[PDB]
Amino acid sequence: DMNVNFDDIGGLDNYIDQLKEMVALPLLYPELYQNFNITPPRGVLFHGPPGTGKTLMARALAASCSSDERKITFFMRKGADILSKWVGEAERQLRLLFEEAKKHQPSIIFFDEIDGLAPVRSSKQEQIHASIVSTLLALMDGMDNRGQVIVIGATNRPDAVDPALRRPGRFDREFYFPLPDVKARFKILQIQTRKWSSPLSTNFIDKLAFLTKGYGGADLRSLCTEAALISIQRSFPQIYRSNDKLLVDPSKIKVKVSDFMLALKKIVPSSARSTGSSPQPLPELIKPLLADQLNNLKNKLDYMLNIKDTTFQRNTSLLQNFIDYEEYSSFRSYEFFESMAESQICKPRLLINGPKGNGQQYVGAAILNYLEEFNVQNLDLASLVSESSRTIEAAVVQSFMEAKKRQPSVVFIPNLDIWINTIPENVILVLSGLFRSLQSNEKILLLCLAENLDISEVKNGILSDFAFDKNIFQLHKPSKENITRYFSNLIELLKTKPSDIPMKKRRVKPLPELQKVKELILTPEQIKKVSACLIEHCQNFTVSQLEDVHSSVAKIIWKSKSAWDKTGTVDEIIKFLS
Amino acid sequence: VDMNVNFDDIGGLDNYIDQLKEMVALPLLYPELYQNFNITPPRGVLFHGPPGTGKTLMARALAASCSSDERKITFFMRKGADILSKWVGEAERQLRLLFEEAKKHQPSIIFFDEIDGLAPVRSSKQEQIHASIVSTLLALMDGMDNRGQVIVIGATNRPDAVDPALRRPGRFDREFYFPLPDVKARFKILQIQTRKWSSPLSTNFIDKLAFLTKGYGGADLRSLCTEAALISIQRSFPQIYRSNDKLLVDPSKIKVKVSDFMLALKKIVPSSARSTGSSPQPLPELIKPLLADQLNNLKNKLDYMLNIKDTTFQRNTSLLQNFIDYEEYSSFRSYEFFESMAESQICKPRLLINGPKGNGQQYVGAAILNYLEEFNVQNLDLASLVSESSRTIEAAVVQSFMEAKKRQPSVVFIPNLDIWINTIPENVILVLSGLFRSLQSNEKILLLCLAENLDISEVKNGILSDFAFDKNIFQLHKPSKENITRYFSNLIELLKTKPSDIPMKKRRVKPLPELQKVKELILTPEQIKKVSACLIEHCQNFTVSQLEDVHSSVAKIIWKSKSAWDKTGTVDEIIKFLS
């Protein structure tokens, strides 16, 4: 518990406004609930992925509603911390909790990890957990008409809470705390790196927000902490050898770009610990080879999914939309314009077909990194047959159901050429019947990537019932300008100096103790000959063959990283490409 | 179980010692640096690795080493799910009282040994009795109130059996892989266990023990030194094993020789041999003439494939010693460009070793896996896939590849590929090929397959065409004349020995003291040349298995007459056998 105000939470302004409403307006403006015979909303259920800001929202509601002109007291009970081996002493300890929260009315109650305290309806296990959920229903249903007991509940899996506790009288509003996008991760990184003695450039924070996809709110905090710790390790290492306190001085500890870029390589986000990785953007080496034809593949995805407009809820908040904008013949016209706004999506399908090894694993990852607000459901082989209990049928059906719950979704099938051979025809037809039983306005994009997929399989074959009619994009091999830029990026390492490479040198003097209180020869005929042989050898090559040539020439270049006579390196590059 | 074991007792984990000092000791001494950036220290590490690696030792040494000053650190320790009872109550209540007493004595370390039994994965049935414990653990570790300076350490064999909500910042933000130690760390562990001893061993003997103990963990090295000391006690004073009264011995002249360690290495089966995959070990000294000419070439090929001897970037063994001994030195064009051009040397590391039937592939695979010491070997052989009877083939292949995807220097190892592509189902090869083509180029997952008489038509237009075995096919050719000459020259060196050189043990002339209770060898050099010529001419165009058959068949004849001084009968029997 700290003095966390609401200006230490980034990206959740709408739920901040709704909580400020339900904690201020039924006690500051009481009259407005009489002319409409309505009760104020009583219960709210916070749910979402871990490290998003649920407990931060409860702590900020505790801190902000504690001031001079009004007192609001906070009662917290953790997950199943109220039960004991005594039979009905848990019922006593819950009833007395609501009694002290009732004889007070500054009280608001919070149940962290409600899915362990109040699980689903008990088919077996008629023990004290069912009595706990029955007394919780019977105790928070009503003992006050229009009272002051807001019961906040935090969980990770909201489907594990009892459905009898998810109703319009108890846990009314259900809030989803989403993993932040780029604009919100920018604000979280400014909230963390705010009171530092030397702040960061905003272009660098934009690059950090671009790099940290899949990072929660806690993982950005961990990245900032690890960058500060690497800066303390880099500035004053001598405090890692003494067992007694030394005298170091702050304001020489500045957090550079290298500390963040080294802290990024060791922090895995919580959405990639049991997955291994996250969909990363297109890497900087092969960006000359594929970003000429990824941008087109972005534009089609900007044309069949309506991403760049986002005509519903484009701004930060709904109340801010009522402040800075003016509203507008509302009965037929609203239905008509909402129908024509939602009718811009027919059936989002995309099959990205190319030759073998033409960078499909980069294009799929770059597209899944580009689609920020989408619930990606992977139908690859390593996610379907990973479990030894569920069948391929049940896995495909459950993944499509999770794609149907969270409505902007991407069903993602990489290596469709393998997927139409490993997966039997029954599961492909089950997925086809699931995709034909959807409305047209449903935002479930079926994305597919394949290598050497014959069009006879998608126009009259097994995939002919997925409607890949005009939505087949063709990754073709990179052209001569792309290969020229790729190998100019390669050749610029042959031109760099042996003193310009970042070879770390040993310090000639030891570290200070603390108080215990020549131009290389490269004639431009050789560079043009290396350019011409690298262009002529990689004629009609795919991306994997170009990376093979790039690695094979970069080994020869990195062997002579200290030499100045670069003639033998050029001759070995000539000799390899023959 | 919280002894005086500190940080000089652990050997070979010098990188995690710096981070555990960074998150336990250094916040206590320097709170002004952590409050300068408004950062909390990282609190809570999940130790994971093979069993017998040093997790509990690291926890106890963290509890005892940072408490040498007058800033005491209490060490609460919990065995793996010993906290739950037959009722619903005490399982959450005891964790409540544990975290409250850890809150009270504020610098504290809670150590959950074997946390995979306390916080298991949410299964299909039997939800309640573990989810009600996971819920109170998650709500107590990173709750709304400040937990204080409670450093939570968990320890496990595999981290996937822990719940993923625990593997999250604020609770288990750091995950430390404790590796089976390399030869320098095994040297340091052997130096640590043989440090208190009265007659210490030499340096080169500990070096030879560090080479001989490949695959051993730390606990196996401790058991080796314990069994060597016990065999030394059995060798010096046997009579204490027969009396029931305490005899008077002196704890001198009981020094551990080499012959005690050489028996302890036979009494100890390591955790590498208990596994079902191919145990990495060097080429044995018999067949090292036959194969080390064409193993070295493979090493050279791997040195051009994985950049082992070219390590200027990604040399992170210890970042703090890197910041101590070295020195720093626009921003993108000096770091990111050169890191990309150093990572862009690994394109697609594959290697298919293909020789005739019986040409020593079971030795070449283990020797390559011994050479790749800093790699993570994941065996995709048949026995490791079918050994876990609950898993399927597909799930085991996907699990091994996903374990190889993390800890990125890794080797996916398929021995007996000719058996593998004939007995694994056809969809599993496509699953593995889709997992390999869904990798980036710069990922160091080497695919190492060894095969016996595999057709090139199967890797050209077959079911292994989607693995890119184009240039990376190495042919183990049959061993040449000089290798066979050196092999049988060692055999001949066995033949021309004297029976006084052949080690026969003793029969002692006097019994042990009770304790106070409280000819010339006739073998002409022409016969040696005849036997060597017959061994060479008989083993024409043979493999390693046929050469070992001939070697065993001749070694039996030589060890028949190991006491005879007239070696003409055994030469006649050797020449009679090879006809």
Ligand SMILES: Nc1ncnc2c1ncn2[C@@H]1O[C@H](COP(=O)(O)OP(=O)(O)O)[C@@H](O)[C@H]1O
């Ligand atoms: N939306 C956010 N904005 C800023 N910081 C956040 C946000 N979400 C989480 N954090 C950081 O994460 C920590 C709290 O997250 P946590 O309470 O662990 O969420 P949850 O309970 O959902 O896992 C705080 O230290 C805070 O700095």
Ligand SMILES: Nc1ncnc2c1ncn2[C@@H]1O[C@H](COP(=O)(O)OP(=O)(O)O)[C@@H](O)[C@H]1O
């Ligand atoms: N890295 C190491 N350095 C020194 N000794 C070790 C190391 N690893 C293990 N040991 C020895 O092995 C013994 C048992 O280790 P243990 O705590 O059982 O590890 P784990 O819990 O991982 O099996 C310890 O008493 C220790 O002396």
